[PDB]
Design a protein around this ligand. Structure first.
Ligand SMILES: Nc1ncnc2c1ncn2[C@@H]1O[C@H](COP(=O)(O)OP(=O)(O)OP(=O)(O)O)[C@@H](O)[C@H]1O
Ligand SMILES: Nc1ncnc2c1ncn2[C@@H]1O[C@H](COP(=O)(O)OP(=O)(O)OP(=O)(O)O)[C@@H](O)[C@H]1O
Ligand SMILES: Nc1ncnc2c1ncn2[C@@H]1O[C@H](COP(=O)(O)OP(=O)(O)OP(=O)(O)O)[C@@H](O)[C@H]1O
Ligand SMILES: Nc1ncnc2c1ncn2[C@@H]1O[C@H](COP(=O)(O)OP(=O)(O)OP(=O)(O)O)[C@@H](O)[C@H]1O
Ligand SMILES: [Mg+2]
Ligand SMILES: [Mg+2]
Ligand SMILES: [Mg+2]
Lengths: 752, 449, 172, 58
């Protein structure tokens, strides 16, 4: 219902663009039953609508090879209509078409180069001799002949805009040649089709800026005036300015663009004069659309603004938008990343009555954006855009354009051997070999990362699930935690329960909590934000909670996102136990975390994982299910886990076969993962020492240690110490036993 | 302007956005602005010499006006264009719908009763949105790319009560456009147990707005403040969500430290703005999640810090005292640490009603387990009564975690079955008793004795 | 041929002394395009509207002489985050930058380069794709890179035979 | 000041109390002081220009 204004409904005029076998520039061919349906005879002049306010005229001809539901047209008519193969256009009879008295055509500059002969004599005169071709202003038509075929721009038609080129019509090629770059910029013009995702938002925008102009009779009959104020808000890169360009390109209404800072002037009352001039220009030009980009630049809250000029500008905009002298059918659009920064009086019905959230697209929306951005790119057959759409979790559309550009840049890099930077031009063979493969898109995906997270980017040391020894159940739980809600939301909908999104790792130091976080950051298919505990805290009042709010907002925007706190007890500590801690800054941070984690806001796929070295001091409300649902205890490894840890540490290390890791794991009772890693590091250091002494010996004789050996491991072991003392295990086991005995039932069985 | 008004007398001079050219001269840092304020003062003083000129000014920031301009002899009369009541909203709706083609089933009285915080521009927006929905219902019959419309389509076009109901669903007061948050669709039947709390909240919301005359007759003012205190996860924020979704009152939900700002004087201004926009949308509910961040005990942390939190709590106390009973602004606070709430906040007249949301008992646990599993396919042999029996110390969050763990176990089983079927080529209709049995061993009691 | 627009925004970041301004000067000298240099504080003015007008004039000058390279040194001074900035002038300057680099009218052939010691102090809207496409980290050089730097800086000086630049590179 | 000193190319600039004018850009909340530090950095970069102007700060 909301998107009902987007359907075409397959009217008889609707036809699918298809390639032309022999159709010339000025003619198109249809199927005979299609003409009989439309009551069109052969040779009748016809009018074809296109995208972005374009129309063309052609001579309809009967072609049996042409499909029933398709219209054949060559590249010239497609480029005139700004349409591609598969596009739907409407064909209608054009009445009262008369022979053109005179037509003025301007050739393209790049085509006329290399042609000594007169453009009119060589091309125009024979092409338009008894042509009887219908043409319209703005069309490009290409004429073959000479060394290079010549493209002409029909700038002037008499009568305008439709005319038949009769032999008596005078054709003249004089004039400034049209730049190729200008026509190229005309071709790559943004329409409503260039916006991917935002289908409901685009539907509302078309309802408000297109429908009242196309069918004002609806609003006139129903006795209401349509909305005239649209505020586009959203995070950066979601496509607000893109929608503004699309509206500017695809409206018949006069378009006036206002950029916030451009309004400002040093003179007294000159900025208000600029605003008044803009609104007067819009009113003078009948239906007009005013778009104010960066609205927060010139529309701050008057209560929060110190300068008098800015407050006067806000008041001037308030009066122009809705004052005693009302607007004369003028649509005002605005775009901002900070809708709450705007003045509250501008947001009412009189001024900005509709607020449109151009939000972060989902998987299908970003697949659509990728298709839009790659429609022009040369792709190999191996490229799968659906996989790339599934991989890019937090991308907004500018990030997808970045990914496509990175893929193309990598494709160009792969040809830097055949290409020479210095040479004048590139060989045609290299150009033909140039394409964007799925490997380039995979590389771009690897480099890709949502822009909103650019500030929260940390270099992670590339840990894999294999690098961690033991903790197999914890690995499975983490993988399922991050993967199930993301890859199988339908299962959760079928069982009608939201996923749990909270995990707290607690245990003795050096047992693998941060290692698990690294494995998640490198392996799990979601965005990852790493937070050291105290980095959010700030000296200023209310800014630590602002940092908490901002980081949770970044995790929400980049969802699915994993939000890891390396030291939770620093940022999350029990309330009321601090005599100082500022004006209760730590307690306010605790409460802000509580609200952000479980409050009245709608829950998103934000997986919040915290690692604490001592969980008894964390606030009890933090551990409440719905916040850190699962409290996972990472204890000292047992003998099997110690074998796994020793193998994982020495997997990349060349170790002699005589070394028995089972015996090491048997002896090292109470050792943590860091302890065993230190044993391996000490063995490596001893081997390096022996190799260095051997090299010194060879140097002395001039003027050994292929792998770590058994004696190296023994000498490393004699230094080994048990880092975690028995009382520490006692404390952690105490917390774990409190957690276990909280349930009260070792085995739960349903009565039969 | 004033001379031309005198030339053509009797004259009226309308000054829209008076605060644009008439701020307080003490706060002004521009010489030309101060000279303009002085010129306005001089002209309005000399207005007495002028025969029949009358100056009317409009502003939505009356406090920003220079005080001298509000004295005797100059702008001495002030008219408060306030928020309309139910009958006034009905009149505004009648005015705006006079030209539209309403159907017979429309009932503007209901629409007037629903719009609790609308001011007249909001009602115009509501009418426009209803008509736009009516036009949308015909977008199937008429395409936008169509050049013209059949006259029968126009003849059928009309606004019905369903369109107005859709508009009311979308309609919200313009003032509450910055405080608006996405709230999950929580319903009273989503909450299990807490029946006395539900009834008390429903009465405390409905009785003051519907029947103030009885309270005036008996001479007792209705309680305008409620605090929720209890163990974490027992249903305070859930009750707030249910109040937001179900009650016909505007809801303002603010996080605790949302108001605090480093710039001196801004946190008090934030409290003033939130309370003022609560008054403008009355009947309104102003919910303070994690109240202890907003309101902590004074003097406990006075020495450590600049003292801005004390100013914030003093401003909050001033706003709680400043409300008249005629404005129906219910204030609800939630905290799981009532022991650190400032004692002044609980004093009579402010947050009077203190409600203990306790750890649920066996019947309440049955209700919670049924409410959570209401939309879930659960096997018949799964006995919820035994689950309530065994989870003695569990809270509502704990039971929800048990159900979620059972759901995840079922999803894991289904995923593994699908993987196995794909493997053999190259299930789990509902949650079962074994799933809950496995989920119960992971279960823990979150709140200690 | 490949159907993309090459990236138009470069943000050089790193600790002081890495050579961001040096790389900007090298690009200015060795490229066949018009070069415009902007310093952060020099844009600032007391009068409202002067600084945005200076930015507009610089970008218009680059657009006329296109293709062009605009280098904005000390981007952190000129472009703080608008949420964390109190002054209206700075916020309007950031908005003017946002509009100039990516607005309804897009720059056809102008390359915008910037250097900043603290990239995280930049407004996140600038670190978006369309404006500052890529961020390049000019970091601390390794031993061989700093040996190359020593060779560059010692080429003009006359050096005795005993001078061993690899040792100096190892020690520093 | 730098332009005026460079005009009289045999010049010595003396910046007394440089600590007040030039704090840490990150450490100080004030944006005026971070901007003045950046401007001083820019002036020092182009200060030499193979000119007799020298700068001494206290
Ligand atoms: N939904 C989308 N579909 C297709 N392309 C998109 C979409 N959103 C953004 N883009 C592309 O990514 C870039 C985003 O720039 P744009 O000016 O449209 O963003 P914006 O939302 O206005 O950002 P800002 O808030 O910083 O002004 C453009 O190159 C645009 O073509
Ligand atoms: N299961 C494991 N497998 C392999 N190495 C491990 C394992 N557990 C710990 N380590 C080793 O421990 C070191 C890092 O430990 P990590 O950072 O994961 O500890 P932690 O539990 O987060 O401790 P802390 O409480 O001190 O923050 C590395 O040398 C890593 O190899
Ligand atoms: N009576 C109940 N019926 C149904 N679900 C409940 C009930 N009480 C709690 N829950 C569920 O358990 C969790 C408790 O969250 P809720 O927002 O109600 O907690 P709270 O009382 O505000 O606690 P906190 O002090 O931790 O903020 C939610 O997932 C909620 O859906
Ligand atoms: N990578 C380098 N290779 C060679 N010389 C270098 C390098 N980095 C710095 N230098 C030398 O040191 C000087 C200082 O470098 P430069 O002024 O570019 O540093 P910067 O920190 O990038 O600058 P700014 O902070 O002003 O942007 C250069 O002019 C050059 O002489
Ligand atoms: Mg924009
Ligand atoms: Mg750690
Ligand atoms: Mg809560």
């Amino acid at each position: 219902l909301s998107t009902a204004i987007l359907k075409q409904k397959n009217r008889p005029n609707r036809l699918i663009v298809d390639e032309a076998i022999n159709e010339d520039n000025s003619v198109v061919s249809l199927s005979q039953p299609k003409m009989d349906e439309l009551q069109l005879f052969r040779g009748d002049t016809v009018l074809l609508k296109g995208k972005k306010r374009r129309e063309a005229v052609c001579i309809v001809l009967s072609d049996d090879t042409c499909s029933d539901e398709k219209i054949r047209m060559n590249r010239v008519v497609r480029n005139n209509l700004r349409v591609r193969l598969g596009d739907v256009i409407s064909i209608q009879p054009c009445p009262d078409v008369k022979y053109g008295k005179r037509i003025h055509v301007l050739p393209i500059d790049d085509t006329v180069e290399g042609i000594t002969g007169n453009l009119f004599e060589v091309y125009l005169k024979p092409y338009f001799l008894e042509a009887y071709r219908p043409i319209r202003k703005g069309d490009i038509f290409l004429v073959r002949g000479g060394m290079r075929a010549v493209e002409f721009k029909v700038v002037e038609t008499d009568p305008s805009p439709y005319c038949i080129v009769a032999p008596d019509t005078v054709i003249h090629c004089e004039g400034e040649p049209i730049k190729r770059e200008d026509e190229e910029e005309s071709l790559n013009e943004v329409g409503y089709d260039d916006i991917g995702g935002c289908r409901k938002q685009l539907a509302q925008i078309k309802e408000m800026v297109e429908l009242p102009l196309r069918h004002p009779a609806l609003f006139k009959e129903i006795g209401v005036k349509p909305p005239r104020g649209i505020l586009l808000y959203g995070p950066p890169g979601t496509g607000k300015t893109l929608i503004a360009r699309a509206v500017a390109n695809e409206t018949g209404a006069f378009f006036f663009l206002i950029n916030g800072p451009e309004i400002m002037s040093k003179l007294a009352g000159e900025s208000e004069s600029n605003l008044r001039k803009a609104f007067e220009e819009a009113e003078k030009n009948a239906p007009a659309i005013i778009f104010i980009d960066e609205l927060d630049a010139i529309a701050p809250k008057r209560e929060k603004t110190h300068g008098e000029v800015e407050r006067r500008i806000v008041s001037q905009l308030l009066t122009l938008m809705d004052g005693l002298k009302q607007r004369a059918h003028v649509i005002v659009m605005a775009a901002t990343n900070r809708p709450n920064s705007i003045d509250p009086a501008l947001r009412r019905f009189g001024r900005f009555d509709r607020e449109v959230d151009i939000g972060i697209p989902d998987a299908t929306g970003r697949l659509e954006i990728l298709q839009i951005h790659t429609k022009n790119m040369k792709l190999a057959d191996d490229v799968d855009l659906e996989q790339v759409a599934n991989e890019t979790h937090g991308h907004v559309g500018a990030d997808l354009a970045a990914l496509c550009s990175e893929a193309a840049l990598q494709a160009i890099r792969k040809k830097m051997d055949l290409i020479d930077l210095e040479d004048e031009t590139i060989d045609a063979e290299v150009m033909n070999s140039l394409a964007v493969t799925m490997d380039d898109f995979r590389w771009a995906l690897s480099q890709s990362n949502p822009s909103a997270l650019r500030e929260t980017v940390v270099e992670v040391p590339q840990v894999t699930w294999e690098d961690i020894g033991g903790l197999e159940d914890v690995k499975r739980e983490l993988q399922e935690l991050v993967q199930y809600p993301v890859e199988h939301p339908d299962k959760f909908l079928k069982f009608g329960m939201t996923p749990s999104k909270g995990v707290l790792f607690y245990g003795p130091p050096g047992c693998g909590k941060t290692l698990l976080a690294k494995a998640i950051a490198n392996e799990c298919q979601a965005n990852f934000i790493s937070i050291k505990g105290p980095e959010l805290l700030t000296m200023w009042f209310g800014e630590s909670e602002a940092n908490v709010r901002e980081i949770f907002d970044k995790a929400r925007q980049a969802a699915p996102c994993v939000l890891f706190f390396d030291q939770l007890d620093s940022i999350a500590k029990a309330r009321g136990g601090n005599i100082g801690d500022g004006g209760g800054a730590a307690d306010r941070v605790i409460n802000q975390i509580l609200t952000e984690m479980d409050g009245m806001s709608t829950k998103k796929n934000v997986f919040i994982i915290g690692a604490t070295n001592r969980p008894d001091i964390i606030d009890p409300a933090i551990l409440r299910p719905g916040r850190l649902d699962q409290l996972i205890y990472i204890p000292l490894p047992d003998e099997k886990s110690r074998v796994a840890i020793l193998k994982a540490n020495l997997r990349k290390s060349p170790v002699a076969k005589d070394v028995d890791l089972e015996f090491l794991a048997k002896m090292t009772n109470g050792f943590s993962g860091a302890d065993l890693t230190e044993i391996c590091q000490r063995a490596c250091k001893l081997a390096i020492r022996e190799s260095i002494e051997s090299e010194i010996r060879r140097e002395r004789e001039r003027q050994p240690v292929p792998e770590i050996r058994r004696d190296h491991f023994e000498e490393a072991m004699r230094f080994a110490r048990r880092s975690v003392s028995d009382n520490d295990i006692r404390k952690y086991e105490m917390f774990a036993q409190t957690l276990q005995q909280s349930r009260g039932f070792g085995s739960f069985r349903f009565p039969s």
